[PDB]
Amino acid sequence: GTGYDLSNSVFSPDGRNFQVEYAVKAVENGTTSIGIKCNDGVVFAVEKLITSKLLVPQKNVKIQVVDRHIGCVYSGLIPDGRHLVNRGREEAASFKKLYKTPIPIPAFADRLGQYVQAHTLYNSVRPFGVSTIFGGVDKN
Amino acid sequence: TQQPIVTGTSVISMKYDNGVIIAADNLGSYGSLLRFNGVERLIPVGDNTVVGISGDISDMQHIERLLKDLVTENAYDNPLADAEEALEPSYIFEYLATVMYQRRSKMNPLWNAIIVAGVQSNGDQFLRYVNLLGVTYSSPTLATGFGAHMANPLLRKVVDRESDIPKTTVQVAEEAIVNAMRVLYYRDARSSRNFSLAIIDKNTGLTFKKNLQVENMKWDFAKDIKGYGTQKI
């Protein structure tokens, strides 16, 4: 039957979710953003596109910071990544509140991944259309 | 409602021309027992502001974590959070005054006495104190608990009115503060010889020192007093 891409949780006959694929295709229509894992830490980079010169230079930024040691650089649907990094900041704040240790990077990854997949299980939520290159330095 | 267990002590503070000087001891008291000596009472938030509080030790740690979370929130999406925009003492002061009020009104307050010392970006000194009950007032000299009626008569002579602030130097303020701390150690059972002194200045920045004790103490007059009364020998 048709309409296997109208909803979210529906499985295609080959077993591939379709709204997630369209979100992936929406991700690629975004500003390029790279990240290099140097020996001591990480180095992010973004290519925020300058539109008509009315935009103020060196003011609009896209490398959002989580806590002190986790950085988030996002591409695609910029607001969706804004909300994702907001939830990530809340999770890091809760962890530091009730553990008093800065969130390790893999733990932040687990939290963000669990949040992201929570939006591709239901029929009443649109999957995120943002890919992030978040990283940083921790104890290990 | 609750009963504080590990009570704090007095915290002394007084402003001068180029900034404010705050000082406190390092001692945690459980009833009549002096349990912890490494307890810190001054938590410098940012560079131009230092907050000194007293009360329940769990409560100071809770407030400290609140301050760290506030700094983390201020650091978010603020490219000027380092130089132009900063957590000036007024903002954090009314934040913790508000949270103190919410704790009180809910009928589960936190036994505390918060003093915040800071310098405004325009150069004006800030010095204000708030208790668990939420009373707020700004004075050239503040103290806590036992020290409220103890340190004020000492610090108020050097600086008494607003006109006295420009006429007082940092060295005079420091010697007045150390003499006051000597007096409290002489006359308060909840203080120790060790203490901590912090200096804030709009030019030299924050000056914080650790491992400070009380010297220049006179005791040779106590061997000429014999007996509690009619007893002579």
DSSP assignment string, A53-67: TTSPTTT---EEEET
Please tell me what DSSP assigns to residue B229: S
Distance, in Å, from the CA atom of A69 to the CA atom of B101, rounded to the nearest integer, reads 33
| Helices A78-99 and B57-75, axial angle in degrees (round to 10) | 160
Count interface pairs A-B at CB distance under 8 A: 20
Angstrom distance (rounded) from CA B200 to CA B180:
19
- Domain holding B231: CATH number? 3.60.20.10
Concatenated DSSP letters of A14-53? TS--HHHHHHHHHHSSS--EEEE--SSS-EEEE-----ST
Q: Is A72 helix (H, G, I), strand (E, B) or coil?
A: strand
Catalytic option among B1, B9, B144, B169 = B1
Q: Are B118 and B89 in contact (CB under 8 A)?
A: yes
Contact A64 B77 (CB under 8 A): yes
Sign of the C-alpha dihedral, residues B63, B181, B155, B164? negative
- Block residue for tokens 């309409």: A3
Residue of B77, B80, B85 to mutate, interface with A, max A Cβ within 10 Å:
B77
**A8 with A17: CB under 8 angstroms?**
yes
For residue A90, what are its two tokens?
A: 């809340």
Q: Give the Cα separation of A13 and B170 in Å (integer).
A: 79
- Tokens at B99, concatenated: 């949270």
Residues shown for chain A:
140
- The answer to whether the beta carbons of residues A108 and A66 sit under 8 Å apart is yes
Residue A34 structure tokens: 């790279």
Would you state the structure tokens that stand for residue A57, as one six-digit string? 């230079």
Residue with the two structure tokens 């407030």: B63
Q: B219 — phi, psi (to 5°)?
A: -140, 5
Q: Resolution of the experimental model in angstroms, please?
A: 3.6
Backbone phi and psi for residue A132, each to the nearest 5 degrees, phi listed first: -115, 150
- Looking at this protein, which amino acid is placed at residue B130? V
The β-bridge partners of B7 are B29
What are φ and ψ of residue B179, in 5° steps?
-65, -40
Query: Per the CB < 8 Å rule, is B65 touching A97?
Result: yes
Nearest to residue B151, comparing CAs of B13, B25, B9, B48? B13
Contacts of A81 in chain B (CB under 8 A): none
CB contact under 8 A, A61 and B77: yes
Beta bridge pairs of residue B212:
B195
CA distances from A96 to A66, A110, B61 (A): 12, 16, 13
Give the Å distances, CA to CA, from B150 to A43, A78, A125, B142: 55, 58, 63, 10
Interface touch B69/A59, C-beta < 8 Å: no
d(CA B45, CA B230): 56
Beta bridge partners of B119: B125
Residue B157: phi, psi to the nearest 5?
-75, -45
Kindly state the DSSP code that residue A89 receives in the 8-state scheme.
H
Contact B65, B16 (CB under 8 A): no
Active site residues per annotation of A: 31
For residue A69, what is the nearest residue in chain B, using CA coordinates? B72
Task: Say if the Cβ atoms of A67 and B79 lie within 8 Å.
Answer: no
CB nearest to A97's CB, from B69, B77, B79? B69
Tokens of A139: 């104890």
Please tell me which of the candidates B65, B72, B79 has its beta carbon nearest to residue A61: B79
Which residues are CB-neighbours of B60 under 8 A, at least 6 positions away? B8, B41, B53, B54, B112
> DSSP letters along B13-62, please?
EEE-SSEEEEEEE--EEETTEEEESS---EEEETTTEEEEEEE-HHHHHH
Contact assignment for B76 to A100 by CB distance below 8 Å: no
Task: State both tokens at A55.
Answer: 């935009």
Q: Dihedral sign, CA of B175, B181, B183, B186?
A: negative
Domains: count for chain B: 1
Question: For residues B184 and B150, is the Cβ–Cβ distance under 8 A?
Answer: yes
Chain position carrying tokens 């957590």: B87
Residue A117 φ then ψ, to 5°: -70, -25
Q: Which residue in A111, A110, A129, A128 sits closest to A119, CA to CA?
A: A128
For an interface test with B, which of A58, A97, A101, A103 has the most B Cβ atoms less than 10 Å from its Cβ?
A97
Which residues in chain B are closer than 8 Å to A97, comparing Cβ atoms? 65, 69
Who among A59, A65, A93 is closest to B69 (CB)?
A93
Counting Cβ atoms within 10 Å, is residue B195 exposed (0-12), middle (13-18) or buried (19+)?
buried
CA separation for the pair A14, A45 (Å, rounded): 37
Kind of pairing between the strands at B11-15 and B28-30: unpaired
CB A83 within 8 A of CB A73: no
Provide the strand spans (E) within chain B.
6-7, 11-15, 19-25, 28-30, 33-36, 42-45, 49-55, 112-119, 125-131, 136-137, 141-142, 195-201, 205-212
Identify the residue among B62, B72, B78, B80 best suited for mutation to test binding to A, counting A beta carbons within 10 A and taking the highest: B72
CA distance A65 to chain B (A): 6
Which one, of B114, B115, B90, B117, lies nearest residue B103 by Cα?
A: B114
CA distance A132 to B136: 46
Question: Domain range holding B121?
Answer: 1-233
Cα–Cα distance, A25 to A20 (Å, whole number): 9
How many angstroms separate the CA atoms of B155 and B128, rounded? 15
- How many angstroms separate the Cα of A88 from the Cα of each of A32, A70, B181? 22, 10, 46
Which residues from B are below 8 Å from A when comparing CB atoms? 65, 68-69, 72, 75-77, 79
Asked if A65 lies within 8 A of B69 by C-beta distance, the reply is no
The partner residues of A130 in beta bridges, in order of sequence, read A76
Q: What is the C-alpha to C-alpha distance for residues B154 and B159, in angstroms, rounded to an integer?
A: 10
